[model samples]
Target: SVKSEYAEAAAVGQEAVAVFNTMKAAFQNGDKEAVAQYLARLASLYTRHEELLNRILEKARREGNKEAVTLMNEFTATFQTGKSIFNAMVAAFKNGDDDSFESYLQALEKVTAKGETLADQIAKAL
Candidate 1:
């Protein structure tokens, strides 16, 4: 029972983190499959706090609510762009060895910089 509980806890924690990361990444990538998986994981995490988030949203809307929807929508776009840059760099590093590594690293840096710039623009638009 002790081992089982420990393992279960670890698994739950890992899954929660993973889901959060996945959702963040999926939004950035505009990947439907990734989005679905992310949503599934999110559902799990939100199961307990879903009502709380809704309540906050409801209260926020009930108040002035000028840019609540706008802010929410913009957040998703910014999140995706940022996520893409981070994930791409990570993938590049993970995909190669010494020689290719340098090239990938250089590209990663450039891509990341551009990505960040674009993401900032996206954020500004929102």
Candidate 2:
């Protein structure tokens, strides 16, 4: 169960990395439309991962898979908080609230690193 769950999450993470690549490329290349497109795509991807994580966590817990349960709990907490920050960043980006977005994105960058480390641990489990 955890193997499949990790596979799914990692698949999402892989997709996330690609979207980030394209989004940043678009930004650097002055393609506002593609940047905007990828941002929305990432927002949705993160949203999907959040939902998928909840299901994974539940399955892990029910099986008394403590290691995974702990990891999933950490992931749930970390990603949820991180996404809430990104959600704020999105609103700010949309509103052109420059300072707020910068602050939010900064926070998100750190959270993203934290998430990747946790994700790696999960990846190994899978």
The candidate scoring highest on lDDT is 2
Off by over 4 Å in 1: 1-66, 97-126
TM-score for candidate 2, residues paired by index: 0.83
Tens digit of per-residue lDDT, candidate 2, span 1-126: 667877887799779878876765665566767767788999889988888888888877888888878887888888888878878977876786767866875687788876777887865653
What digit string (tens of lDDT, one per residue) describes model 1 on residues 40-88?
5545553433333334335445664546545534534443443454345
Candidate 2: deviation at residue 98, Å?
3.3
RMSD of 1: 13.7
Winning candidate number (TM-score): 2
Clash totals for all models, in order? 1, 0
